[PDB]
């Protein structure tokens, strides 16, 4: 469940089918954005997991798995940065902030797209009788 392997798939397809050059940059920016998002998520989730562990409600192996993922994310982001430098020269000082912004923008876009599906769950759950023009007919 990630965009890490999909970039590798696009790369393998490019090595054979001669795709354009900007598709690689798009996949790379997407992987960087996902890495930034996951890093921030772990950085804000660490204390709650630590408290759950100290209280004795999470187990002993999940804590080690979490501490391993913490540095796996850093390794993945370092690999992403190395690949970004390899693909375009002198594109490391700007790539980081570009990813930092596309992360927030795409998260906001997903949240805004979700309301069209959020609107019908409430109709089903509250048994509203809505005709055309969104008005109620009791």
């Amino acid at each position: 469940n990630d965009a890490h392997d999909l970039y590798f798939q696009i790369k393998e397809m490019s090595e054979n089918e001669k795709i354009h050059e900007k598709v690689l940059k798009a996949a790379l920016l997407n992987r960087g954005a996902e890495s930034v998002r996951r890093s921030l998520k772990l950085k804000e989730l660490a204390p709650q997991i630590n408290l759950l562990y100290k209280n004795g409600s999470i187990g002993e192996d999940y804590w080690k798995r979490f501490e391993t993922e913490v540095k796996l994310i850093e390794l993945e982001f370092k690999d992403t940065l190395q690949e970004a430098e390899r693909l375009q020269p002198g594109w490391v000082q700007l790539f980081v902030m570009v990813c930092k912004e596309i992360c927030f923008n795409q998260a906001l876009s997903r949240r805004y797209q979700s309301i069209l599906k959020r609107k019908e769950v409430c109709i089903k759950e509250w048994e509203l009788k809505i005709n055309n023009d969104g008005r109620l007919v009791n």
Partner: protein, 190 residues
């Protein structure tokens, strides 16, 4: 798997069934590719564009002009078109601190227009998004409680009024809404 088009340069997964995460990621990659095709300079800056901003502002002003002429039908269409264009034809790497406030400023007017028109569920969902995305003000809970009372949801309405009064206890409208909610709920239980 996934197929790669030639002229449109769009990636589409030709599989029989695909998960939701893969579809979202392919759509995001397509949006980024379409933005990069148009953006000419190789080292793009998070500085926002200009012509897109002028177009959005023009559409929004053309929509707001209809409020003076008292046409409450096509003004909503123009505002929705402006919001759709802002959400569609804007590059993802543009500044967030300039991309969010414009959306808020247009969505508030769309909310007021939908509330005056008579559509309450669309307005309620817009209020909910605007509140969950980081805007908590006494001017939001009033309209949200009004909607929840208009479509007969009294416990949620009372909770909304209570959270609104827990922020600005000097408000004069939230108290009237709380009184009305208590009356409707006391009629609803007894």
């Amino acid at each position: 798997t996934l197929e790669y088009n030639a002229n449109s340069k769009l990636i589409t997964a030709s599989d029989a069934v695909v998960a939701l995460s893969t579809e979202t990621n392919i759509d995001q990659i397509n949006v980024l590719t379409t933005s990069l095709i148009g953006e000419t300079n190789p080292n793009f800056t998070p500085q926002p564009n200009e012509a897109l901003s002028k177009m959005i502002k023009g559409l929004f002003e053309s929509g707001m002009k209809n409020l003076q002429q008292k046409k409450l039908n096509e003004a909503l269409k123009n505002v929705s078109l402006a919001i759709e264009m802002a959400q569609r034809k804007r590059a993802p790497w543009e500044a967030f601190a300039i991309q969010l406030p414009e959306l808020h400023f247009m969505l508030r007017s769309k909310i007021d227009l939908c509330l005056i028109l008579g559509k309450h569920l669309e307005a309620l969902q817009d209020l909910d998004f605007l509140l969950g995305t980081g805007l908590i003000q006494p001017d939001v809970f009033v309209r949200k409680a009004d909607c929840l009372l208009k479509l007969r949801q009294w416990e949620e309405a009372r909770a909304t009024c209570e959270r609104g009064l827990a922020l600005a206890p000097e408000d004069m409208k939230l108290r009237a809404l709380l009184i009305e909610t208590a009356r409707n709920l006391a009629e609803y239980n007894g």
